[PDB]
Ligand binder design. Structure first.
Ligand SMILES: Nc1ccc(CNC(=O)NCC(=O)N2CCC[C@@H]2c2ccccc2)cc1
Length: 164
């Protein structure tokens, strides 16, 4: 079936727990495969050690810039950027897993987990998964964000990987 991956997340060096995500390979296989491989680190790069650099309450938690750590970088397993696969899945509510971008067809590694329905992003950002467990962990991450996105503690993916 669709892969399951995990992120273990700290806030100023204190464990928050684990987020488990289903990647919807059956709808967006390319986009799903990118995230998977970046969780495992199997290409020699990926999410381990990187941060949630932009977190806004009642919107979303953004992470995945493992090259520059500032929200400008990241790269995919296909090269630095790749196209929008499709917009079949929608931003239907909390726990949606979606690709951050800098305009049409600029997916790299940056991603976000929604904390509400973000239906205004439908057709703008490729949804490619959903939280299976750890939505309480996402709420804790959310509690360290702000209107601007600037976080109040350093939110770190200490470890990540593939479960199935
Ligand atoms: N490969 C790559 C991907 C993203 C960027 C930075 N762009 C960004 O952060 N854009 C905004 C974005 O994607 N999102 C996703 C949800 C939160 C935020 C956003 C979107 C719409 C309005 C306000 C913030 C640079 C390189």
């Amino acid at each position: 079936g669709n892969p399951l991956v995990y992120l273990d997340v700290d806030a100023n060096g204190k464990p928050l727990g684990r987020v488990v995500l289903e990647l919807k390979a059956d709808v967006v296989p390319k986009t799903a495969e990118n995230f998977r491989a970046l969780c495992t680190g199997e290409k020699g790069f990926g999410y381990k050690g990187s941060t949630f650099h932009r977190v806004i309450p009642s919107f979303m938690c953004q992470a995945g810039d493992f090259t520059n750590h500032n929200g400008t970088g990241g790269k995919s397993i296909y090269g630095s950027r790749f196209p929008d696969e499709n917009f079949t899945l929608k931003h239907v509510g909390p726990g949606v897993l979606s690709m951050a971008n800098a305009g049409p067809n600029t997916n790299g590694s940056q991603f976000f987990i929604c904390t509400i329905k973000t239906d205004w992003l439908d057709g703008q950002h490729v949804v490619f998964g959903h939280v299976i467990e750890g939505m309480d962990v996402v709420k804790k991450i959310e509690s360290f964000g702000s209107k601007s996105g600037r976080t109040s503690k350093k939110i770190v993916i200490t470890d990540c990987g593939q479960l199935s």
